[PDB]
Amino acid sequence: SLFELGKMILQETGKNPAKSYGAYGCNCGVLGRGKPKDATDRCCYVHKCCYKKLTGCDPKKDRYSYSWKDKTIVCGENNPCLKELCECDKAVAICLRENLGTYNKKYRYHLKPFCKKADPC
Amino acid sequence: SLFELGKMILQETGKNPAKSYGAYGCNCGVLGRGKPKDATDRCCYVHKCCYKKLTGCDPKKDRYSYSWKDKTIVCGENNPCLKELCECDKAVAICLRENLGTYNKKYRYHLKPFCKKADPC
Numbered sequence A, B: 001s002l003f004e005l006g007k008m009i010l011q012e013t014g015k016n017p018a019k020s021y022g023a024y025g026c027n028c029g030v031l032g033r034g035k036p037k038d039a040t041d042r043c044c045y046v047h048k049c050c051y052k053k054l055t056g057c058d059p060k061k062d063r064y065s066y067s068w069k070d071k072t073i074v075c076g077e078n079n080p081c082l083k084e085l086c087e088c089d090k091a092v093a094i095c096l097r098e099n100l101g102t103y104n105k106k107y108r109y110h111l112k113p114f115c116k117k118a119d120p121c
């Protein structure tokens, strides 16, 4: 759920999840996807597409278990959807971290409207 | 949906929705409710409870139409859930605007652990 997602982002990026990624670009935050503004945003884009593949679980509300082992997010077995979900979240946190270098605060509270329609996943 | 909600909030408050309300207090933006920290936060609490009352539609995903008439958000739905949904949104947008006077930036990104259990809707 958003709690694990937030925590992962926090863990990987060291940044307050909500502040930095709760609303960034066309893809990080609420409101589906949009043409990504940058790498960071693309992480969220990929992340939302990742969520699209899920079936059987609520990416937002369903909590799941994962562990921080050797400073790596390790998804708990949970169940297939939750594990996949967890993997989606883990991927985006990793991705956001990898792209922290080009994080651009100007995209922080980007207005969802000024986002080009995203390509289908 | 959040698209209309966000637009309403911007329209009423004149503030970037994600920036001011994406994560404010215990109820604005954050997942779930919490004892409101203040009036602004209470708006979101009320809004979330309003959402809980809806039966035939998805408050997050379902789009509905509304118009801006005489600088008033005018829901344009007859479907009861979409109408109610729209009204929930309109109400929080108005409420957020009516409470900008006690809006406090220190509640932005308020840490969930500080939130006390919300009263039941």
Ligand SMILES: Cc1c(C)c2c(c(C)c1O)CC[C@](C)(CCC[C@@H](C)CCC[C@@H](C)CCCC(C)C)O2
Pocket: A002, A003, A004, A005, A006, A007, A010, A016, A017, A018, A021, A022, A023, A028, A029, A030, A031, A051, A059, A060, B029, B060, B111
């Ligand atoms: C409706 C909706 C929202 C609002 C949303 C997303 C999706 C898919 C949705 O359908 C995806 C990403 C994000 C951008 C989430 C980003 C951050 C949050 C999950 C914050 C979690 C915060 C907690 C744990 C701890 C970290 C903060 C430290 C200060 C302790 O917000």
Ligand SMILES: Cc1c(C)c2c(c(C)c1O)CC[C@](C)(CCC[C@@H](C)CCC[C@@H](C)CCCC(C)C)O2
Pocket: A030, A031, A111, A112, A113, B001, B002, B003, B004, B005, B006, B007, B009, B010, B017, B018, B021, B022, B023, B027, B028, B029, B030, B044, B047, B048, B051, B060
């Ligand atoms: C899951 C969930 C979320 C995430 C939520 C709330 C509730 C009740 C929920 O159950 C209430 C308020 C808020 C904090 C509001 C956040 C605002 C976003 C909806 C904004 C998107 C803003 C865009 C469109 C505005 C610009 C458009 C122009 C056309 C005017 O977020």
